[PDB]
Structures are given as C-alpha cells and as structure tokens.
Symmetry: D2
Subunit: 222 residues, 4 copies
C-alpha cells in the first residue's frame, strides 16, 4: 500500500511534542523566516542538515542535489543562493559534502558514455577529478573515494565564493561567510575541511585555486 | 562571528545522544542507503522533511529548491528523480508545497521584467498561475496565496507523474506512488492535498489536468 | 574519409567571390558587428536565416535550437536575447518556425516516457500542444502537424515578449519589435503569421494569450 | 520602421532565383533532411555556416550560441547533438570558433560579479581560461584574445568528443568525426585548428587534454 496515514501520524506526533515543549516553536515562523544559514548539501537520504545540526524550523535554508554541486549555470542552486543572500541576508553558507557519496564515486568510476540525466549531472565531479590526477591516482578505491569527496567540497566552496551572487554581496560590503564541511553518514559527525572564508583576503589564504586571478584576470595580462 | 565551533558542538551533542539511544543508529547506514521515499519540497528554512516526519537517516532522499518545482528540463531535480526511481527503487514520492511560500507569492506579484535568477526560476509558477487564472480571480491576497500554493502542488504532482522517469517506471510495472502534500509552517502539520496516485488510473481520477491525454495525445488526431 | 579539404575549398571560393564583388564585404565587420535583427529559429538543416533572407555577414544574430523554443530558464537562448537586446541594441527579433518540423511532430506524437535529452527538450512543445486540444484534435496527421508548428510560433512569440529582457527593454523605451514568421522548406518561402509587435499595446491586439494579465497579474485579484 | 515587407520581398527574390537555377532546389527537401554535418558555432552575426560553406538547404544542421559552447548539462546544445548523431546519423561535427569573438573577450575581461544571464553563460569560457592561465600570461590584449578563441575551440572539441552522445556513438562503431575550426570575420575564411578526430586514437594524438584519462580515469586507481 501507498497509504500515508502512518507518515502523517508520525508528523502530527512530532508537531504535537514540539509545540508542547515550546508553545511558539511553530507559531513564531508562521508568517516569516529569518535563517542565518544557507546549507548546500547532497540529496543522499542519510544527510539531513536540520537534524544533524539540531536546528529548529527557521534556522537553515536548504539546497540539496546529487553530489552537492554548485554551478553558475544551474538556476535551481543559483535561485537558493540569490534569494538567501540578497533578500534574507543570511550570514553563513555551509557547503557540505559527505563520505560514502555515491555521486562522487560515480564521478570517479563511470564511463562518460553512460546513458541518462544523472551521468550528465555529475559532469562537474569529473571536471574536479580531472584537475586532480596527481592526488587521486594510485590510491586504494576507498581512499580515492574519500579524497574525491574532499576535493569536491573544496571546488564547490570555490564555486560559491566565485559566484556572481557572493561576489556582488562582498563588493557591497555585506557580511557573508562560506564554509567547507564534510559529514560521515556512519558516525553522524561533521568535520571542518576549510576554515571560514569571509572575503577575498581569506579565500587567497585558504583556497588552493586562485580566486583573485579568477576575478581579476585582466591584471595577469601584458 | 563566523567561527563554527558552536555548530560543530551542537552536531557532536546530537550524534552522541542518537548513538547512546541506539548504538547502530549511524553505523547501520555507514556504507549504503535504502530509502523508501524521495521528497521534493521547498528550500524555505521552515520546512525540513526528515525532521517533520521524525525520520532517522536513510529514510528520505531529498531535493529542495525555491518553490518545490519539478521540470523535465531541470537536470538538478531530474537527477534526484532518476537516481531514486531507477537505482534506489524508492516506493513513494512526496511532492510537498507549504503555506506562506514566498516563491508562490512572488509568482503572483512579481512583474517578469524583475532582474535576477530567482525571477527566471519562478517562471514555472507564473505558468501554473496563468493556466488557473480564473480560480485566482477576485480572491483576497491571503486566499489567492493559499490557492497558489495548492495549485502549484497539484501542478508539480502532475509534472512528477508525467516525467519520463516515472512514466518509464510505471511502463515496466515498478510500484511507485506520488503524493501531493502541503505543510503549514505555523503548526508543523502536513495535510494530504491529493490521495495516493499509483498509476494512470489513479491519475485520471485525482488530477485536474488530463494525464492520459498528455501521454496519448496523438490518438485523438484523425 | 573525414578530410575537410573540399569544405575549406568551397569556403575559400565563396569568400574570394564575395570580396571580388565588394571589397569591404568582410573587412567592414573585421572588428565589430551592428546587426539590426536577432533570429531565433530551428536547428533543422533546411532552414538557414542569412541565406533565406539574402543577408550578408553582420546583419542577423542567430540562435537556432531544436524546435525554435524560447524559455526564461534556458541560459543558451536567454544569453543570445540579452546580448543582442542590451548591448547590440538590435531593433527586430524574428521568431521563426518551419513546416515539416520534426520537433513539432515529435511533440505531438511521442510518449513522454521516451528516453534521452531530446524528449526532455521538447517538453515545451507538449505544453503548447496541451493547451490546444480544441485546435488539434480530429485534424489529419498532416494538418495537425502544420497547426502545431503555427501554435508553437505563437507561443514562442509570446515567450519572447514576456521575457525579462524584452520586458525590461520596453520599460526603458527602447524600440524593439517581435515577429512571428514561418518557413516552408519545400518552397523556400517565409510567411508572416503574426504582424509586428512593438510593445504591450500591439501584443494585446495580436496575441491570443493575455500578455498584460501575465505581466500585471496582481491587478486581476481582489 | 517595424514593417517586414522588404525582408519578405528579399526572401521571395532569393527563393525564385534558386528555383530558376534548379527547380528541385527546395522541393527535394520538402519532407525530409539528410545532412552530413552538424555545425556548432557562435551566434555572432558575422558567422553564418551554410553561407560561408556555400551549402544548399539540407546539408548542415546548426546549433549557434554565444561563444560556441558545448556542455553536457545544456539540453539545448545536447539535443542538437543527440538528434543529429542518433537519428540523422551525421558523419562530421564542425566545432567552429571565430576571431574577434566578444564572448571570448568577455571571458577574459569581465569580473564574475557582473549581473545578467550572459555572464552566467560564459562561465565555461572562464574555466577554459583559468585552466590555460599560463598560456595567456603576459600576452598583449590582441594576442590573448586570439589565444582565448583558439583555446576555447580546442576545449569545445574535447567537450564534443567527451560527450555521452559521441562516446556512445563511437562505442557502437558509428563513423563520426569531430573538427576544430576557426573563422575570421574580416576575411570570410575558415582555418582548421585541429585535424579530423575520428575516435579515441585521433584524440590521443591531437588534443592537449587527455581524453583517454577522462574516459578511463578509474583504471589508474590502486
Ligand atoms: C549514478 C550516481 O549518481 N550514483 C549515486 N550514488 N549515491 C548518490 S547520493 N550520495 O547522491 O545519494 S548518487
Ligand atoms: C522571489 C522569491 O522567490 N521569494 C521567496 N520568498 N520565500 C521563498 S521560499 N518559501 O522559497 O523560501 S522564495
Ligand atoms: C525527436 C525529434 O526532435 N525529432 C526531430 N525531427 N526533426 C527535428 S528538426 N526540425 O528540429 O530538425 S527534431
Ligand atoms: C558579454 C558578451 O558575451 N559579449 C559578447 N560580445 N560578442 C559576442 S558574440 N561573438 O557572441 O556575438 S558575446
Ligand atoms: Cl533537508
Ligand atoms: Cl545559421
Ligand atoms: Zn552524496
Ligand atoms: Zn517556499
Ligand atoms: Zn524543426
Ligand atoms: Zn562569438
């Protein structure tokens, strides 16, 4: 059966207990939100940002897609970025990858001829991979996987920092930080991969790739 | 200001307590997932699917985006759908809108010349709206907003049922149900807007738009 | 063989004759362009806009895709629109469909479960189709095809007029017209389907769908 | 100002003369096409493929977009590619850049905070640029611009060869060649930047990026 009764019952029991412990738990967000965080993470069923950070409704705005990817040409992720940064004025963007991420493994192993949309989607993972032969080759299957996850976080942090939305927000002096983090489904713990990046100065210090030259390329020419 | 230790500490507290309540809580999903559900919902910070359904990790795979939109030409939501239906073999897709959704309100009130990627992204909403313009005619602002949310949930349920991925899964006799639900941020409760749709028969019964005609349109030419 | 010699030879012979008849034919566009037209048409090999209009280099900027489709969420077509309208200040946008357009036929006949990217792409054609059962049903295969082509032109003209780019240009008083036209591969002739639309006043007169209500929807509510 | 009769009349003049020179010119492509080529080139008004190769209708299927970009996650250029390779069985794909391409120049000079969809769309160009930053270092503006155009043609040739569609066609032994060419708007001439690539062997010989490593990367893990 496809009956939803038991699901709905679990929700009702949850909202009942929540509101019993704190009468304004839901009511205070009945007509507005003011989260301080955007989280961009993987769609993987093991990785729920509000649960894992013990956040209540109204604290974290969420984009989740296969592989936690950020591209300037993806209107879905870019709309979550633009709405949160420009209208909600969130303060912090958490870019979260996770170990055991099948999208990262498929990015390592699949032949690109593979049919379907997921294989198109994870092209970004191949691009990150391809720039890192030297860190990936010769590693055990497992270690290569872990490394791919990590490299993917770093690249997606760079993409968030280089995004027109973040770049415009920094240029107008809006406070905005970007965090590279990674989660372990099998332990429920988050680790910090990259320390906070609050602007171009921190990005030059903390990112391998050169954000400054990316933004001001013309200054590297004759 | 931007330091993460407080968040990390909340995450550690949380993981210890879950491990203390059940020591296989995380470890049993360390290397695989077998969720039964895919949830497609809004990125709004007040709506966290695993939390609101009181699910543990490994139970609901998640796509969240501004206004809970589903289009065959978004590779972001389409890859969540492909991976879950084709590879994980989920059984149920929950398509969840929410009252007080500002993407629905913007789809009613914004002029389309408005700059930025969010206005591009909510084009889908304007189309749902335009197709149902007579239903929205003359309603108070609040009523029109609530009706916009509901019409959009019905439209995204139709889009999920009409998708190549779901249509192909049904053609091969894979059991797969689609659910139109709505959440009220001010109460924490889910309501079922549309009963379970398990196939074409259900869709003919339950949807205002004609899925059979969409799938077999050319049978009505001379 | 994949040798390009004969192709290159045909090009050299062409550029030689062109420049022999008119010494500045190429040189005057060696370092800038100032076209007055954007053309959005089908990628079909039988339909070449500069040939069919007898235009020389520098007169018509071109987007061509399968089915001549225009969506606010397609960065490829939207970049051609934005660059031409905002930077080149073109004056006229030709939206050209063509009879015998296999994309329009596939939009009529394909089952949506059909695999691959083209089937995703032509979802727009289904949406136009779906809004027109009354004009399509009961027609011969051939007449339905022709009608689909025509309806698709009209819808894509509306999409160009409703685009944020065109809407912004009209709001600042930039002169910009939009033309619905159709080509017959088997005769080489263009026909005018919709007369010129130079702004909101003409669009209310010449488009079936209501552009004004689309742009100012809020004014239809209580 | 916006009336089309002059354009329509040029079109009639042109069609009569072609029919007068050869009375089966149009009629022989009235109901089908069998082009041998797919051309992917820039939307720039100075570059019209059928004209510059002196082709009649039915010879070259065309995708044109700002900066002649090819990405697996653009359904617009991917559907041109799928339809031609899989259904029309074209033999040759021409990937054509052009000197004096302002999309290449913007990819060197724009800051990424720049508003609008064109800046999103040329992100691909910035990535080609960033990967080849040492080649562009210290060149005069003109030299860097010409080198940008060339590096982008090579990158889009690689992207075409790496695409699922071409890779699958080669895996099935379909003959299909890919060509890197460049056009000079000021002279009307095409130059061949990269010799014909007919398969993996050719690609290994001719491309600066390693297509074999992209396709079989995981063979180099432990
Ligand atoms: C083909 C493919 O993407 N495989 C995946 N496996 N696990 C995934 S996860 N972490 O995104 O849920 S995606
Ligand atoms: C322009 C716009 O989209 N406004 C939004 N307001 N709330 C949104 S929500 N519910 O997606 O967080 S989107
Ligand atoms: C599946 C599909 O799209 N079929 C096509 N047939 N002809 C086309 S055309 N006019 O775009 O070249 S596309
Ligand atoms: C910002 C930008 O893209 N500028 C352009 N200039 N010329 C272009 S062309 N060769 O695509 O017509 S694009
Ligand atoms: Cl979530
Ligand atoms: Cl063309
Ligand atoms: Zn994952
Ligand atoms: Zn919402
Ligand atoms: Zn066509
Ligand atoms: Zn160009």
């Amino acid at each position: 059966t496809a009956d939803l009764s038991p699901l709905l019952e679990a929700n009702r029991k949850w909202a009942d207990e929540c509101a019993a412990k704190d009468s304004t738990y839901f009511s205070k967000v009945a007509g507005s939100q003011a989260p301080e965080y955007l989280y961009i993470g993987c769609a993987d069923s093991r990785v729920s940002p509000a649960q894992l950070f013990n956040m209540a409704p109204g604290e974290v705005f969420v984009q989740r897609n296969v592989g936690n990817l950020v591209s300037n040409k993806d209107l879905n992720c870019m709309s979550c970025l633009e709405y949160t940064v420009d209208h909600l004025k969130i303060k912090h963007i958490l870019v979260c990858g996770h170990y055991n991420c099948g999208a990262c493994k498929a990015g390592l192993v699949w032949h690109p001829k593979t049919a379907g949309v997921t294989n198109l989607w994870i092209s970004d993972v191949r691009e990150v991979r391809d720039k890192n032969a030297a860190k990936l080759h010769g590693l055990s299957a497992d270690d290569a996987w872990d490394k791919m996850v990590e490299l993917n976080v770093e690249a997606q942090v760079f993409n968030v920092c280089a995004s027109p939305i973040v770049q415009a927000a920094w240029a107008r002096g809006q406070p905005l930080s970007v965090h590279g983090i990674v989660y372990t489904p099998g332990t429920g713990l988050v680790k910090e991969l990259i320390k906070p990046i609050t602007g171009m100065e921190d990005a030059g210090a903390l990112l391998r790739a050169d954000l400054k030259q990316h933004c001001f390329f013309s200054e590297s020419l004759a």
